[PDB]
Amino acid sequence: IVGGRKARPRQFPFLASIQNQGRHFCGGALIHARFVMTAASCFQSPGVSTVVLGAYDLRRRERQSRQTFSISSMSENGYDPQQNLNDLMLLQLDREANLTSSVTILPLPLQNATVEAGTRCQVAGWGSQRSGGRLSRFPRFVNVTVTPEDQCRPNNVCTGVLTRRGGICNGDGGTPLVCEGLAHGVASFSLGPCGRGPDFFTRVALFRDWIDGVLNNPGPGPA
Ligand SMILES: *[C@@H]1O[C@H](CO)[C@@H](O)[C@H](O)[C@H]1NC(C)=O
Ligand SMILES: *[C@@H]1O[C@H](CO)[C@@H](O)[C@H](O)[C@H]1NC(C)=O
């Protein structure tokens, strides 16, 4: 996260940390006790990662706070790598997370809901503060603004900071964009230097139904 402030413990309790060999590579959100919503793009270079909930300081063990999980199944709906279309993915946890003061669910918008340009949102994560720089051990967050459609693409929700540098950076992939208390976006990509803008998030409301379907039909799938 660029241009942000350090978060307090349990300030974004729905946040997730996707790690590989203990190395954080993407963020995500708990949207249901058994699933975490993230970015399909996070999965290119698979499920031999872990999902960490309730973390704060990436360097500590915070045993009394964290819950760790394996990924039983991955669900994508038309992800297109080439264009980065439909960059959204659902991970099913090996087991049901427990809901504590440090681990909660972030609600979803209704199918097709919209957010207008100029709307104020928040984004948090452990990503770096500079292109190719080092991750942040504490989560950080920044106030962002929804841009005009013309600045974005239909599949996404785009944002910017009134200020200078602000936005997502390395490690912020799949982290959620939260507007009016709901997960309106999933961090996808951004062009050029972190902080420049605008930032591209998958438009969550377009997938509500498909998501519900997944939630309602759990289980690895065809074999
Ligand atoms: C959402 O919008 C699409 C395209 O505008 C439409 O075809 C579909 O009927 C809509 N779904 C509902 C739940 O409004
Ligand atoms: C976010 O916005 C609120 C409301 O304007 C503000 O008072 C607060 O300082 C901001 N925090 C940062 C991290 O932008």
UniProtKB/Swiss-Prot annotation:
Question: GO cellular-component terms in the record?
Answer: azurophil granule; azurophil granule lumen; azurophil granule membrane; extracellular exosome; extracellular region; extracellular space; intracellular membrane-bounded organelle; membrane
PANTHER family, alphabetized: AZUROCIDIN, KALLIKREIN-RELATED
Q: How is it modified after translation?
A: Cleavage of the N-terminal propeptide which is composed of 7 amino acids occurs in two steps. The initial cleavage of 5 amino acids is followed by the cleavage of a dipeptide to produce the mature form.
| Family statement drawn from the similarity comment of this UniProt entry | Belongs to the peptidase S1 family. Elastase subfamily.
What this chain does, per the record? This is a neutrophil granule-derived antibacterial and monocyte- and fibroblast-specific chemotactic glycoprotein. Binds heparin. The cytotoxic action is limited to many species of Gram-negative bacteria; this specificity may be explained by a strong affinity of the very basic N-terminal half for the negatively charged lipopolysaccharides that are unique to the Gram-negative bacterial outer envelope. It may play a role in mediating recruitment of monocytes in the second wave of inflammation.
- Show the propeptide residue ranges: 221-223
Establish whether keyword Glycoprotein is in the entry: yes
List every stretch annotated Possesses antibiotic activity: 20-44
The protein's recorded glycosylation sites are: 98, 112, 143
Residues annotated as domain Peptidase S1: 1-216
Stated name of the protein = Azurocidin
Tell me the name of the encoding gene. Answer: AZU1
